[PDB]
Design a binder for this molecule. Structure first.
Ligand SMILES: Nc1ncnc2c1ncn2[C@@H]1O[C@H](COP(=O)(O)OP(=O)(O)NP(=O)(O)O)[C@@H](O)[C@H]1Br
Ligand SMILES: Nc1ncnc2c1ncn2[C@@H]1O[C@H](COP(=O)(O)OP(=O)(O)NP(=O)(O)O)[C@@H](O)[C@H]1Br
Ligand SMILES: [Mg+2]
Ligand SMILES: [Mg+2]
Lengths: 873, 873
């Protein structure tokens, strides 16, 4: 004889939390909450072994299981002083299915089992007559559907028949008298559709419900899942029978919700609402207004104390802030639902640190209690009072890109571009978005799309900028031609507020505060930095940018793109354009002399800004089409002659000879430095000259030179030869030798496939996962937009591979180069400077393969630091 | 006591061929030729162990080695009836160094050791006085240089002093009296530069020479090599001392050369020349004209018989045709040099098959006796009589691309393009060549470059077309402006003949014969096909092309590029252009209906032409920029409206929306079929409709559908879904189900890295090594020309990676996908259709990794068949 029924009640549980296998997911959870002393209404759980015996007994209850169940019902009846079927003191039950793991095709929950004409009459004496009858029709529908196999549409048919006959649109506007008549119609659907009438004996209703739960396990919907997921070794589903409690049984009863701490600020104070003589539905429906918890304390003192004690137990056992749902039924507090409560970014760090000071959790735990998105909220503008506008929220979409923005609405990109140039903050609103308007999106303070998703074009480009965005908000329809949003006709030009962190879109101008520092945040990040394994460098090409990086925690610079160090002045581009068009090696060397001071000065500032940290400078890797002006080839070629002074026929044939079909795979990277050593000699001279000058002013310079787009060790060996030669010249000309390192980019697939050859020549690798992703997938980053959305929406891709690292494909090359590289050169250092360097899931993969550091934009360093810490916990 | 000197003579050898370790390379060879009974002048070899003992004895001859050497000299003296130093009957010796393997920095050969005033006087009595003195100065120079360490420039200084004083340019125009005076000047250089005079005792000269050979082994030039190549375990170099023989000692003596069979035709007849009373130098210098061997037989009968017997021994031992060098000295035949003789393509197969019929070699050996280039000669036009023009050859460069062409000279590409359109055969001659004129090179019948190489732009594009080319001919200087070749002022327009197989450039019109079949060739290739392991399919998009392939031995079609099946008619491109510009899915489907008949008809012809063989059709993979006309965007857009009838404003914005920055990585391959299933549905419909129609006419159809540019298994699964759906429609509409296969291209690196995922979905892989090479290296095939030559010439690359498979990089992905694919799908078939499919070294790599077949252009199938056979032997 084996036990198959396990009762649970406040402080008393026959099971335990570790028995997921026997009681199922929820059943073991109900035992857990009960054991720790939470006020859960009493009930019982029929084990999964019982379900198996039911199968092995021809889908008939096994021997003595029913007597075993009745024993448990008697326990529940005694704890509640109610009994099944008694109109004076009826026991109503919930029936829930649950396996050892999430499972589709399982039987749905059935509420208020134990109702019938007699019982419902009694219930109407404590609740409204409307509630009792509305609760009866719902049971008849759910029961007839979930348990008797009657399609839901048969009941709903008789419902819409009455609504149309009465002439009303909403269910809430059917009178209690109507619902009483509607009850009898539902009872007839049983006869019409099955020839068997609704069973009125609660015990009969329960037996049928127990069979249905076991039956649902062997359903086609269920078997179809378990076969797909290759999951063997499950006996069945458990049945969870629990007593129903109500908050509308009089003035001694009520329903409320709370977070054990404030979810916007993190204050260690209960935070919630409570409504006397009502149900949870009445709260969120808006039929009536709740009241702050304080009210409960002053009118239901004993119930409030038990609530306070319940909340203490929660945080003591779950070691975290909890979002709960409770109801007081005739002065007895009952715990219904609890779950870790959603927080704001600010509230996450506050609660994380407070619980550490409280000795409730350690720092390691705390580091995984603040999501990278939580931290992201703190790195961006924020709304002063998150809940002060709760009354003005008109819809809530997806939190595409965290942040907060406010501005006037405009329905096109060009006009969002017109409105920025005139001073104003623009909110771009379009049904969807495509690469055809990346410029207009770069002007708008915030973005909002009707059709979209976490991997939409709006969401991906927005996150790459840190720009606020709310994507995929089904509630909007956006008329480009008509210029109105119908969520309420929202005019073009009206002030709209967007919360990219909660997905909320809000009416009117809202108060905005800047990202500020706090002692909690400062303390939190210090924990992350101590536990961290990966160093976090920065991608900075400007002195001012290096400064911003170091302020954000950068431990150095892992990539200084030398091609992006000429956008500031026209004198700089006119200098660049002098070389691109150079044909005579005298004119080429002349243009390089014109460039030397610019490169040297910049490098000096960068070294000064990164005083005492590593600075990895990368040799040229130019986007030519970026350096040539807009217009006709008529308009464009005139400007080139206006800088260069080459003959107009000569400047023409040069653009001819410079254009490429595939520039991303063309004359770029080291292919330039090798074809034109003069170019590399100039750069390497500016570097060392700067290094010496700054060293002489007491600056600690730790320079690294880097060769881009290498696919062969011979390419790398070539540029190094050029470097070492220039190093001797500068160090001899200036009278100081300076220690440096020389390494390579690993952004070509061949470079990973033969990394062992390249490691014997290089002092460090850094993966350029932009090109490497482009080369591995054969996706042009400029042109990928022509099909990426079709792939994402059709399940071909799960993420924008240029944003989230492809671990199976791209990641295999990274894991390959690192292993081969370290095996061939134990002193090799390995890092990253592709965009994936700042992406959390990517960072975790990099710590996994044992990289030394990661590098990312200055604004992304903090997130990379937290990601680097979360992975080692 | 260990033996360190090993004599050799006709039929008598103390060593053997397998003693390379002790006698060195040449020493073991001299023992080999002697053992088999060849008429090699007698000599001896001082072992490599002797050299080691010399080192371990402070660079002094070890104990008794000298007595051991003198014993060997006595043998040589007795076999020749000459003795060192005897003016009446002098023994002259050659001293040669030789290790167990090729070795730089080793001592050079020294000839005519044993000369002095007395001996040289005697020698002048048998040769000319000029020869004796010219031979003396040469010994003094070589000996003083190689053995005494006197720089060669000191002797040559006194030589140019006399030439300038006498006033003559060439050495051949110094009288014997001059050379006699020049001898004494060389003897003084010994005193001036060393204070030690020339040693006159031949035995002293030999001892010094033996020391020099041993010394050279421990030279800096030598040690620098062995250290580079990580080659341990060599004791030293052997010394090879051999008797000198001369063919200018009177009318009983002479010098000749022969191939044991004809090198142009393969006839089993000796083929060579012979000159009485002369030296090899007199032959090739042109001072005197040789005579056919037949002459030797009739005036030196005994010497000729011994030659005939020597040649029989050669072919009997070496089992191959031999190119030899012999001299008769006073009626004794002496064998000097032998080596496998170079043949023509025609001569290779003739000799290969004849030796099989003779039972001299088996078929397996014969298959490796015909180089892929030999066969290539037979697949192209050829010169009627290779040696009839030997008198007209003006220079010989590198055999870039095998073949033969004749035409008038032109010094530019545009004018070679002007001359083809007017009917004539053009020979393009430029110093070098670049991608700027691939069109002009496509017109010229032959190509000739002054500066180039086997990996020049001329040679690579020429081989890709099968077009004749002779590259890197230093003897030309090519004045573009002046229009003359100075090799002789060659005018523009003059008839020039080019032999791309021998690198010979020839004066005037030459006779050309077409590639014909022979029983030898037909028999040879049947051997190759029996032994072959890989099947050889063809890349054919046209019925006529499929025919040409099957005539060349194609076992099927491994790649039918569907994008190249619309170049024939204007009605076809106007149909294509209808779809590219389609925006309305009604107009898109309309354009597809216009295309269906074309695709169906073509497929029908292809199936018919490949009746009973596999045909692998590949879904669309279009080069858009190829389908749009030349001119301004003004001129171009008018034509699009002239086909489409779209509004001129609408056709404008469409080109805008269709252009790409990197089309090779853009909207192509399966990304089209997935974005526009209509396109794939049309193609797959034309395929099956054709398949059924031809099947109904008794044609055996074995169709395979193929998805291009896949990087994910989801991409592949998508198109297959479209295929299987259309297959049902056609098979139901026409009332016949037909067996087919569906597979994928493996041309994206990610597809190889996760091949196991793609193999569970595909029935076969074929590596597209064009894109895969492009993706792996990050080389754009269109734009790579901007730096590929700089890489090749600087040692960064050893081959054009798009021509020769990169085995370390690209090959790793191929070896990876195949292993993973077969492990996940044992029924998977793997092939190739990139250009590397027809390249011999690549084919060997593919048989290595165990591929099922290769595929290549119709004209390249025979070479691929021979390559496929050579690898398994
Ligand atoms: N004994 C009760 N007294 C009162 N109200 C009750 C009682 N048991 C349930 N309910 C309510 O019935 C509804 C459905 O129950 P569930 O347990 O399915 O709830 P969820 O957690 O939202 N979905 P899940 O993923 O299936 O767990 C909820 O609103 C709960 Br609070
Ligand atoms: N005993 C001889 N009687 C006559 N002439 C002789 C004799 N020994 C040599 N020679 C010639 O001297 C020259 C140089 O001799 P080598 O053996 O070096 O010749 P190669 O094969 O061309 N180069 P290798 O790579 O070093 O072997 C050749 O022309 C030879 Br035939
Ligand atoms: Mg890069
Ligand atoms: Mg391809």
């Amino acid at each position: 004889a084996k036990k198959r029924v396990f009762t649970f009640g406040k402080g008393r549980s026959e099971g335990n939390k570790d028995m997921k296998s026997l009681l199922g997911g929820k059943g073991a959870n109900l035992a857990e909450m009960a054991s720790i002393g939470l006020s859960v209404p009493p009930g019982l759980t029929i084990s999964t072994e019982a379900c198996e015996e039911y199968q092995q007994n021809g889908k008939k209850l096994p021997p003595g299981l029913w007597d075993e169940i009745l024993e448990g019902l008697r326990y529940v009846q005694k704890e509640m002083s109610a009994s099944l079927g008694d109109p004076s003191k009826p026991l109503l039950l919930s029936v829930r299915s649950g396996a050892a793991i999430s499972m589709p095709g399982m039987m749905d929950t059935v509420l208020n089992l134990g109702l019938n004409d007699e019982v419902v009459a009694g219930l109407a004496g404590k609740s409204g007559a409307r509630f009792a009858y509305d609760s009866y029709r719902r049971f008849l529908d759910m029961f007839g559907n979930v348990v008797m196999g009657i399609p839901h549409s048969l009941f709903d048919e008789k419902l819409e028949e009455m609504k149309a006959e009465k002439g009303v649109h909403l269910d809430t506007d059917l009178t209690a008298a109507d619902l009483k008549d509607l009850v009898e119609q539902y009872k007839n659907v049983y006869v019409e559709a099955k020839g068997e009438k609704f069973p009125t004996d609660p015990k009969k209703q329960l037996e049928l419900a127990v069979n249905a739960v076991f039956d649902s396990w062997d359903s086609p919907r269920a078997n179809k899942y378990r076969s797909i997921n290759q999951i063997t070794g499950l006996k069945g589903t458990a049945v969870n029978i629990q007593c129903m409690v109500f908050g509308n049984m009089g003035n001694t009863s009520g329903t409320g919700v709370l977070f054990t701490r404030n979810p916007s600020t993190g204050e260690k104070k209960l935070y919630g609402e409570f409504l006397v003589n009502a149900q949870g539905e009445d709260v969120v429906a808006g039929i009536r207004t709740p009241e702050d918890l304080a009210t409960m304390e002053t009118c239901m003192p004993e119930a409030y104390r038990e609530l306070v004690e319940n909340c203490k137990i929660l945080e003591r056992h779950y070691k975290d802030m909890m979002d709960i749902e409770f109801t007081v039924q005739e002065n007895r507090l009952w715990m219904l639902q609890c779950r870790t409560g959603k927080r704001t970014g600010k509230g996450a760090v506050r609660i994380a640190v407070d619980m550490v000071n409280e000795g409730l959790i350690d720092t390691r735990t705390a580091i995984k209690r603040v999501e990278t998105q939580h931290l992201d909220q703190l790195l961006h503008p924020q709304f002063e009072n998150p809940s002060a506008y709760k009354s003005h929220v008109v819809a809530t979409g997806l939190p595409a890109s965290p942040g907060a923005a406010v501005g006037q609405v405009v329905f096109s990109a060009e006009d969002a571009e017109t409105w920025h140039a005139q001073g104003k903050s623009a909110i771009l609103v379009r049904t969807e978005t495509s690469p055809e308007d990346v410029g207009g999106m770069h002007a708008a303070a915030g973005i909002l799309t009707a059709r979209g998703g976490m991997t939409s074009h709006a969401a991906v480009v927005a996150r790459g900028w840190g720009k606020c965005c709310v994507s995929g908000c089904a509630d909007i329809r956006v008329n480009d031609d008509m210029k109105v949003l119908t969520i309420r006709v929202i005019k073009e030009g009206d002030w709209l507020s967007l919360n990219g962190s909660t997905g909320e879109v809000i009416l009117g101008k809202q108060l905005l505060a800047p990202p500020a520092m706090s002692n909690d945040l400062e303390t939190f990040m210090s924990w992350a930095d101590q536990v961290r394994r990966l160093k976090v460098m920065a991608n900075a090409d400007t002195p001012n940018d290096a400064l911003t990086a170091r302020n954000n925690g950068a431990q150095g610079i892992g990539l200084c793109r030398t091609e992006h160090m000429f956008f500031a002045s026209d004198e700089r581009i006119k200098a660049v354009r002098k070389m691109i068009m150079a044909v005579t090696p005298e004119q080429r060397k002349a243009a390089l002399d014109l460039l030397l001071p610019y490169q040297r000065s910049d490098f000096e500032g960068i070294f000064r800004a990164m005083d005492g940290l590593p600075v990895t400078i990368r040799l040229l890797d130019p986007p030519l089409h970026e350096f040539l002006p807009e217009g006709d080839l008529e308009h464009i070629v005139n400007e080139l002659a206006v800088d260069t002074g080459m003959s107009e026929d000569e400047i023409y044939s040069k653009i001819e000879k410079l254009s490429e079909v595939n520039p991303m795979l063309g004359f770029r990277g080291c292919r330039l430095g090798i074809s034109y050593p003069e170019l590399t000699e100039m750069q390497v001279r500016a570097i060392f000259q700067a290094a010496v000058s700054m060293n002489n002013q007491g600056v600690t310079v730790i320079p690294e030179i880097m060769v881009p787009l290498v696919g062969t060790p011979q390419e790398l060996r070539h540029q190094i030869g050029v470097i070492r030669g220039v190093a001797a010249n500068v160090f001899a000309e200036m009278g100081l030798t300076m220690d440096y390192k020389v390494g390579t980019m690993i952004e070509i697939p061949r470079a990973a496939l033969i990394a062992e050859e390249i490691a014997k020549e290089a002092e460090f690798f850094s993966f350029g996962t932009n090109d490497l992703t482009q080369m591995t997938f054969g996706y042009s980053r400029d042109d990928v937009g022509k099909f990426l959305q079709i792939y994402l929406s059709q399940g071909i891709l799960q993420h924008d591979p240029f944003e989230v690292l492809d671990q199976k494909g791209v990641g295999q090359l990274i894991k390959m180069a690192t292993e081969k590289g370290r095996a061939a050169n134990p002193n090799l250092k390995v890092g990253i400077c592709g965009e994936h360097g700042g992406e959390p899931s990517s960072v975790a993969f990099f710590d996994g393969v044992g990289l030394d550091y990661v590098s990312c934009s200055p604004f992304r360093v903090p997130i990379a630091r937290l990601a680097a810490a979360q992975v080692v916990v």
